[PDB]
Amino acid sequence: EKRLDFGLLGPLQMTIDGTPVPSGTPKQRAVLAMLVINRNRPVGVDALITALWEEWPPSGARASIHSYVSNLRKLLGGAGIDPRVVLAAAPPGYRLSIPDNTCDLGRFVAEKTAGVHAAAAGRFEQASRHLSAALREWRGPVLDDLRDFQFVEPFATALVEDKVLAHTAKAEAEIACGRASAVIAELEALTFEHPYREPLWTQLITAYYLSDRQSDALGAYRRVKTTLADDLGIDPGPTLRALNERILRQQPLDAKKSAKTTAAGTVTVLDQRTMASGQQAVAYLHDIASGRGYPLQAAATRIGRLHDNDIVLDSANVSRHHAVIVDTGTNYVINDLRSSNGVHVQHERIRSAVTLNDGDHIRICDHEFTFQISAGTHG
């Protein structure tokens, strides 16, 4: 009867006919957030308890969950639907059944994807329009009002991978359309906010160079070089180094080819996430030593030594809560939870979080896995 909408890209929002509806106390809001994050999938009661109270649930935690569900159903009933259908009780747990496009993140995902296919086809004006639409879905810090809940941290961090990618693809499209000069200012702002993001620097350096500002381009490379050296102790990657070498030689750039090539790569990623049926493929962690396969079943897959983890690794050197893999709807990103021994992807220690690629080697202490995005063909 009335429009139901939800928001994760900023403070948690539930809106009915465009009017925000306050969704309860922080614990109740965390229930809603968990359900929206896992929209159209069941969330177990045990998972809800861990998210709300991590280490110290009260003795009546389950009664509280039942109350939160009842409360949330009353709120949902204001949209004139059957709350028991929309927020249904699984014997597994609870499931919020909502269309993807009724969630701000769902719209972000859809627009980004449309922008990818457009750029891959050389339709850069349209790609830029879709990317503008995606970025408009962001209101503020992810689940800003629930920042004191631990589950928010890896999820919010993962979604920055996606936002940065969208900013970069937007810059590429604009540059491909001949508007390099008009994106310099935003890129300057973005490289300050995200100083270690080489793809953003790549686009800024490109934009200077194609705006007849060669010396500024070279100066920007020197700046990121110093930043990466001093702050992180690393050299710039091959993409930055190759760009620098072209500019030093006053060689031409092909911004249209670049934007097409990036998009084509992303289409490959989109393909491996999708089955012939159109449903998302289930990503797996395969243990190399044992052959045991661990499906990623929720938005967040928690890994550690403690029994409450989704993937439990018994070794003494593994942290109680060691890592989390987050499915953003666009990428899988692994997060190191300030573990004693760290997380190693493709045989190097990760700094905070990295986006996972299909077939990546993942090491947690002595445990070694293959991360597979593409659907399995044997079992």
Partner: peptide, 8 residues
């Protein structure tokens, strides 16, 4: 387990 993590 809730046992202190061993160091590498």
């Amino acid at each position: 387990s809730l046992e202190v993590t061993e160091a590498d």
